[PDB]
Design a protein around this nucleic acid. Sequence first.
DNA 1: CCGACGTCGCATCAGC
DNA 2: GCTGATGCGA
DNA 3: GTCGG
Length: 327
Amino acid sequence: PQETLNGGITDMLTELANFEKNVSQAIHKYNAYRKAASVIAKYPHKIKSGAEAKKLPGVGTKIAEKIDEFLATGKLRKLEKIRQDDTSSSINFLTRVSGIGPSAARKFVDEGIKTLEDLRKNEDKLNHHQRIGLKYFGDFEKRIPREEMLQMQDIVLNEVKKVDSEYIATVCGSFRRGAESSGDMDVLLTHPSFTSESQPKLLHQVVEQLQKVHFITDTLSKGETKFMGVCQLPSKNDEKEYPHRRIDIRLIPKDQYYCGVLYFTGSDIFNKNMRAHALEKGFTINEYTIRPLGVTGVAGEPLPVDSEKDIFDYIQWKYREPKDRSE
DNA sequence: CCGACGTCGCATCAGC
DNA sequence: GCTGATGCGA
DNA sequence: GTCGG
Ligand SMILES: Cc1cn([C@H]2C[C@H](O)[C@@H](COP(=O)(O)NP(=O)(O)OP(=O)(O)O)O2)c(=O)[nH]c1=O
Ligand SMILES: [Mg+2]
Ligand code: NA
Ligand code: NA
C-alpha cells in the first residue's frame, strides 16, 4: 500500500517503538510496536477505528486504544509528552550513533552529554566503534543507490579473487534480491580450505587487500570469521566524493556457505515462511545447516549442501530467485 | 496467568 | 593475567 | 505489547 493511507499511525508506532528500545530498554515491546507497524503498513484500507485494526495479527487492545486517540485527536498524549522531554529525547537520539546503544546513551545523558556537539567535545569517553559512528553519523543514515552497490561489488569481487582465485564471495542482503537501494553491504566469503571439520588468516588477507587499494577506510570490529567496517568508492574527478558506507565481510565454512547465503539473502518474512514450511516437511533450518527431524524431533546430522537449490530440493520447493523473495 | 518473543561474533567491562 | 558477563549490532 | 499454552 501507500504512506498517507496509514502513515500517521505507522509513524506513531515507529516513534513509540524506538523509545521502548532506547529509553525503557524493553526490547520486546520494541518489536511488538514494529510488528504492529508492519501489518498496518500492508493493510490496503485507510483505517477507521482501533477495532478495525485489532483484527490484524500484532495489534492488540493497547494499540487499538492508541489508534482511537490518534484518529480522534490527531496526536498521542504520551508520545507528545515524551517528544518534549529533555532526557528521553536526548537518550533516544544518541542511540542513532552506531556503537552507542540505550545503555551508553543512558550514561551520557546522565552526565550532561546530550548532543552530537557534546559528543564531539568528549572523544576520550567514546570507544573505537563509537568514534567511527560519530565521525560518519550522517553518512551512515544515508541509503546506497544500487548503481553504487554494483560499483562496490566490482571492487570486492575483483580484490577477493586477486588475493586467491579459489575464494567464493557473494554480496547478499537486499542487493542480491534486486533492491533499488541498500542500507549496507553484506559480503559472504568462503574457501575450499575451510570446512566445519577442518587457516585463521583467510579473512585477514581479504580485509588487508581491500585496505591496500583504499576501499576499506575504517574498522569497527574484526575477528577470524567476521569483519565489520567502513568503506568508500573512489572519487571520480573534482566531482563530489561518495559517502562512507557500512560493510560486513563474513567467513563461512564451505559446507555451511549456502545456508549462510540463503539466510543473509532474506528477506526476514521469507526466512520465516521457508523455515515454517521446512518443519512441516520434517526438516529444521538455521543459518548454518539443514537437519532432518526424527519422529520425536531428534535432529540428525546436517545434510550436505552444495547450492541454494539443494536446500529447496530437500523441502520440495521449486528454487525461487532472490528477486522473488520478499515473502 | 505467565513465558516467549532469533541468535551470536566481537569488543570491553566486572570479577577474580 | 584469565574467564565469563554485558553491550552492541544486525 | 501481543499472543497463546
Ligand atoms: C535482522 C534480520 C536479518 N536477517 C538475515 C536476513 C535479512 O533480510 C538479512 C540482511 O539483513 P540487513 O542488511 O539488516 N537487511 P537487508 O540486507 O535485507 O536490507 P538493507 O541493506 O538493511 O536495506 O539478514 C533475517 O533473516 N531476519 C532479521 O530480522
Ligand atoms: Mg544489506
Ligand atoms: Na489482535
Ligand atoms: Na546506535
